[PDB]
């Protein structure tokens, strides 16, 4: 049973400016099998209004998905993606950083 761990990028749809409406993305790719848990977090708490793309895959057969929700970047609030997968002992939390 081949198991590949997800790669994660967390990022905004548009360039970020405090107080301006945007979309928070978490792109998970390179994983196998396809079962995966992805939450978007605001100040550590799971955001409820979260959608995702239709499961698809790359030439090497590894899966990818985009999770996304509306957010407003601010000076103080911390945003993040929480990912869990059979290949992970514990949930991986990647923080949003407007510089990437």
């Amino acid at each position: 049973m081949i198991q590949r761990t997800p790669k994660i990028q967390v990022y905004s749809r548009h360039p970020a400016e405090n107080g301006k409406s945007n979309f928070l993305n978490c792109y998970v790719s390179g994983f196998h099998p396809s079962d995966i848990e992805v939450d978007l977090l605001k100040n550590g708490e799971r955001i409820e209004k979260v959608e995702h793309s239709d499961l698809s895959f790359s030439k090497d057969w590894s899966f990818y998905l985009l999770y996304y929700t509306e957010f407003t970047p601010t000076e103080k609030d911390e945003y993040a993606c929480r990912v869990n997968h059979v290949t992970l002992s514990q949930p991986k939390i990647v923080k949003w950083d407007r510089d990437m």
């Binding site: 049973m1 081949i2 590949r4 790669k7 990028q9 990022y11 749809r13 548009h14 360039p15 979309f23 993305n25 792109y27 790719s29 196998h32 099998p33 396809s34 079962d35 793309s53 239709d54 499961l55 698809s56 895959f57 057969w61 590894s62 899966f63 985009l66 996304y68 510089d99 990437m100």
Partner: protein
Amino acid sequence: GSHSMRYFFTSVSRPGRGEPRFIAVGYVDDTQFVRFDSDAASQRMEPRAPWIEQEGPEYWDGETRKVKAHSQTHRVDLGTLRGYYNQSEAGSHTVQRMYGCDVGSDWRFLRGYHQYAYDGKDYIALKEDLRSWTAADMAAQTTKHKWEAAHVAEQLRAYLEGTCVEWLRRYLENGKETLQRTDAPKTHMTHHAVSDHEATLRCWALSFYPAEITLTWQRDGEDQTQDTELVETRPAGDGTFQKWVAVVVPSGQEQRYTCHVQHEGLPKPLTLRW
């Protein structure tokens, strides 16, 4: 320019109760236009781009019919594969199938594909000539012989050289305002000190379509790959794509470094400087 149509299919067995989870997506180039999800309420092939909504009820009936047949094929496959590999009933397993055609600038046939994977590994694939099979192991070799017996390759080749390219041509015309438009990358550079002595230069490409792009660094007009980070191209979420490439440089030396961007939507490549 050149174009493609691809369909992707994933079935995941659900041991203990019911049929597999089945998900099917169709793409023209990098644009998803249709989907099926066995868990969704409609139990229909569903539109995902505005230009496919032109198609009449006979189109949707026909596509629903075929896609549900694909899901049953894969359901049967999961059972068969379990026996080929002496696996138990207790585990969840995955089959994946991809097929489609490419066309050149004249929109004539270039290439066809049909490939198949079990638990994320190559199982069997149609060769470029569309006449023969690549079977990865002896389980797939048994499939190879069945498919030879049943003239699968001849049936697929007719589809990939005929129907596939005819409908791709049709979708390209119907969807021309978006599918036949290139969105050139919107580029800029950012600067991030890492210490008193070094800085990161980050070269961004935003809102581009299609996804294919090349971002490179040069130092004093020579190629620079050391101390660089290149992220995988990622969806913006609105149909376009993003990527960046970064380089660590001695502070004060930013001017030696240039970022180079190649994309279908740029007549000539772009050069950025700090």
